[PDB]
Scaffold this active site. Structure first.
Site, PDB file in Angstrom:
ATOM      1  N   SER A 160      58.414 -12.348 -55.305  1.00 53.31           N
ATOM      2  CA  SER A 160      59.435 -12.498 -54.282  1.00 53.31           C
ATOM      3  C   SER A 160      59.392 -13.769 -53.461  1.00 53.31           C
ATOM      4  O   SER A 160      60.309 -14.077 -52.758  1.00 53.31           O
ATOM      5  CB  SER A 160      59.488 -11.310 -53.376  1.00 53.31           C
ATOM      6  OG  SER A 160      60.413 -10.417 -53.850  1.00 53.31           O
ATOM      7  N   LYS A 189      62.315 -16.227 -53.526  1.00 57.35           N
ATOM      8  CA  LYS A 189      63.502 -15.970 -52.766  1.00 57.35           C
ATOM      9  C   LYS A 189      63.745 -17.080 -51.740  1.00 57.35           C
ATOM     10  O   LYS A 189      64.826 -17.282 -51.326  1.00 57.35           O
ATOM     11  CB  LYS A 189      63.525 -14.568 -52.190  1.00 57.35           C
ATOM     12  CG  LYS A 189      63.960 -13.560 -53.208  1.00 57.35           C
ATOM     13  CD  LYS A 189      63.231 -12.265 -53.081  1.00 57.35           C
ATOM     14  CE  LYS A 189      63.572 -11.354 -54.235  1.00 57.35           C
ATOM     15  NZ  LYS A 189      63.104  -9.979 -54.082  1.00 57.35           N
ATOM     16  N   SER A 193      63.398  -8.859 -48.775  1.00 58.73           N
ATOM     17  CA  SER A 193      63.119  -8.951 -50.186  1.00 58.73           C
ATOM     18  C   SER A 193      64.036  -8.176 -51.109  1.00 58.73           C
ATOM     19  O   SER A 193      63.606  -7.713 -52.118  1.00 58.73           O
ATOM     20  CB  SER A 193      61.694  -8.516 -50.426  1.00 58.73           C
ATOM     21  OG  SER A 193      60.849  -9.585 -50.440  1.00 58.73           O
ATOM     22  N   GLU A 242      65.566 -11.066 -60.866  1.00 61.02           N
ATOM     23  CA  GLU A 242      64.865  -9.843 -60.534  1.00 61.02           C
ATOM     24  C   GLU A 242      65.117  -8.772 -61.585  1.00 61.02           C
ATOM     25  O   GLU A 242      64.247  -8.043 -61.942  1.00 61.02           O
ATOM     26  CB  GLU A 242      65.195  -9.335 -59.143  1.00 61.02           C
ATOM     27  CG  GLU A 242      64.419  -9.983 -58.027  1.00 61.02           C
ATOM     28  CD  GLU A 242      62.968  -9.584 -58.006  1.00 61.02           C
ATOM     29  OE1 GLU A 242      62.566  -8.732 -58.761  1.00 61.02           O
ATOM     30  OE2 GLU A 242      62.218 -10.139 -57.239  1.00 61.02           O
TER      31      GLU A 242
END
Ligand SMILES: [Cl-]
Length: 276
Positions: free
Chosen positions: A46, A49, A110, A146
């Site tokens: 994550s 991101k 997230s 993802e």
């Protein structure tokens, strides 16, 4: 002595830890630099991101599109069985959401679906990869969404980075060298507002220490291996100056609390040296 003593101390701390840990520190307003196990490629999870956010904001700045612009998100886009506050909030999908709301969910909380929606908006994973590379930061690989990462176990390894690259990227961002003032202010705020990873970079720091950061986490395979336990960010020292730090705990046999503690202790040791 000095920086070298710190590095050695960190190295000693890691010797009995059953993980591959990567560390990078860069002072924001000074010459401080530290690297431990820099060469290795670490899976981001994550943490990526943040990069994605830079790309979206940059796109908004260039095309002069407001952060309040709404995007229709199809129901098919809000995938189930994945961490997504957006899905939880809008179970039926088919809704128009501002980029701001999407960004907030993605960076602060997230959101996986949010990340994928944003990847679509900027044109895909390669576009982000190109954007980052074109900023002068090498050694960052961005190949998977993802959704893609949620399939085979080793897909996550394709999104990788060196610790120093992250730190270089963070510093550029922190000094407002990438985006507009409005965009910069927004992203930074989202990074501060998060409640994720309290036991990571922030764990041993003093109450009230301002930390803008982004966490990254992974599953644990059947051989007891947790692929990634990460925290990256900008920390504010007592004197008001700042430093960027990135810690990647990868391919770890350690318990989850230990993995977080490693990030916390390492950061704490850097903090102590820097305060002095
Ligand atoms: Cl910036």
């Amino acid at each position: 002595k000095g920086t070298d003593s710190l590095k050695s101390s960190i190295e000693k701390y890691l010797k009995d830890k059953k993980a591959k840990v990567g560390v990078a520190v860069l002072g924001i307003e000074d010459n401080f630099k530290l690297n431990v196990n820099e060469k290795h490629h670490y899976p981001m999870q994550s943490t990526y991101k943040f990069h994605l956010a830079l790309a979206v904001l940059d796109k908004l700045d260039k095309e002069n599109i407001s952060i309040d612009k709404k995007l229709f998100v199809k129901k098919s886009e809000l995938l189930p069985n994945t961490w997504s506050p957006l899905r939880d909030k809008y179970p039926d999908g088919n809704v128009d959401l501002s980029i701001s709301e999407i960004l907030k969910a993605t960076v602060s909380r997230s959101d996986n679906n949010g990340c994928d929606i944003l990847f679509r908006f900027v044109g895909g994973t390669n576009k982000v990869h190109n954007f980052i590379s074109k900023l002068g930061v090498k050694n960052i690989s961005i190949k998977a969404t993802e959704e893609e990462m949620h399939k085979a176990w080793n897909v996550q390894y394709t999104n990788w980075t060196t610790p120093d690259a992250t730190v270089q990227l963070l510093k550029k961002f922190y000094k407002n060298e990438i985006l507009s003032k409005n965009s910069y202010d927004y992203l930074l705020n989202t990074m501060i507002e998060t409640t994720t990873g309290p036991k990571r970079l922030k764990g041993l720091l003093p109450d009230g220490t301002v930390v803008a950061h982004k966490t990254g986490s992974s599953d644990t395979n059947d051989k007891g291996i947790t692929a990634a336990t990460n925290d990256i960010g900008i920390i504010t020292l007592p004197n008001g100056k700042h430093f960027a730090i990135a810690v990647y705990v990868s391919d770890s046999s350690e318990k989850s609390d230990v993995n977080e503690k490693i990030i916390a202790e390492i950061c704490k040791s850097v903090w102590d040296y820097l305060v002095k």
